[PDB]
Amino acid sequence: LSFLYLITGNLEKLRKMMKIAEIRKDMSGHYQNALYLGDVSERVRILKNCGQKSLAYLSAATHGLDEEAESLKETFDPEKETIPDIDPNAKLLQPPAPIMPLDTNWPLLTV
Amino acid sequence: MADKVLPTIPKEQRTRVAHFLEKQGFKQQALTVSTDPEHRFELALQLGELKIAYQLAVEAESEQKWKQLAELAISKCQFSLAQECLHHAQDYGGLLLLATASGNASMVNKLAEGAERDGKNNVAFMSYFLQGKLDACLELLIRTGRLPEAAFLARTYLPSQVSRVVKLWRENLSKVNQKAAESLADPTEYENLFPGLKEAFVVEEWVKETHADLWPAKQYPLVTPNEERNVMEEAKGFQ
């Protein structure tokens, strides 16, 4: 259903749902909320699952917020030292600008 | 004193004693004696000469090694390499978690290739999307027989495949006759497609967009570029 909601070009319903299944635990699923979005709040939770400031940085940096991820990372006694490619490079783009719909509701006919 | 003896011990001996050494907790030293690929390997896990462990791996000769190792590498946060091993493993799932977290297209192409590999429909889609590629998502659907669903995407974010696709879906339906089951129209009648005139296509927004895809949305960030995708987005998008 969530998928239907993201298919369609509108934003909330998925988010409450996201709340209500985030709230029902998770280790690989948060992902669903993030892409079609920019911003995620999941990160507040996420760090707790990870909490190695690593995820928090990778995620963090672009809202102009790499920084908190570093603060903890330091506090720990950091453990990061090498990284692989991953520089945001894939397009979270597509959906439905004016003319030629969405489909909340879909019309048809027996004919 | 022992060292003089040491020449005068070989293969297997080294192993036993190595275990003793290991018991001594003279792991490094235990490493020096080290004498079985397994033996070396486990110790290596404990030990973490990372590169060194790789050489022992050499050609690992078991993804299981890589899997085990991957967890370890990741712990050491020796990712550049980890990626190489994991990639070498091509063990997609864990590897995805990293790759995604910083984000990356390149990973995505190779992966796309992978995506094709995996054998359940769903992941591959996220990828296609993730990349931004309706086209890919839709092509994927063609193989799986996702047909109702494919239509929704084709509609929402318009590649107007809704017209193309709908005919085919309908055809299936058609096969399974009954007029209601057949179901029919694209520009006008049942559907009024382009005559409805509403929210998944056009040039101007699109032009702005054309660029948009190219820059980073911005708010304040890192070398790891911007795109956003929230309230603002909705507003311009309408424009």
Residue numbers in the entry:
A (entry chain A): 703 to 813
B (entry chain C): 605 to 843
Which sentences from the paper describe this structure?
Coat protein 1 (COPI) coated vesicles function in retrograde trafficking between the Golgi apparatus and the Endoplasmic Reticulum (ER), and between the Golgi cisternae in both retrograde and anterograde directions. Coatomer (the COPI complex) is a heteroheptameric protein complex, consisting of α, β, β’, γ, δ, ε and ζ subunits. Arf1-GTP recruits the protein complex coatomer from the cytoplasm and anchors it at the membrane. Polymerization of coatomer at the membrane assembles the COPI coat, which recruits cargo molecules and membrane machinery to the assembly site.
In order to generate a complete pseudo-atomic model of the COPI coat, we performed rigid body fitting of the available crystal structures of COPI components, including our new x-ray structure of βδ-COP, into the structure of the leaf. Our new structure shows that γ-COP interacts with β’-COP via a highly conserved interface in the base of the γ-COP β-sandwich subdomain. The platform interacts with the trunk domain of γ-COP, whereas the β-sandwich forms a conserved interface with α-COP including both α-COP β-propeller domains and part of the α-COP α-solenoid domain. In contrast, the β-COP appendage appears to form the main link between the adaptor and the outer-coat subcomplexes of the COPI coat. While no electron density was visible for residues 151–175 of δ-COP in the x-ray structure, our cryoEM map of the COPI coat has clear density corresponding to a longer helix, and we modeled residues 139–165 of the predicted helix b into our density. The N-terminal part of helix b interacts with the β-COP trunk domain, while its C-terminal part interacts with the peripheral Arf1 molecule (βArf1) in the triad. Our structure suggests that the main interaction partner of helix b is Arf1.
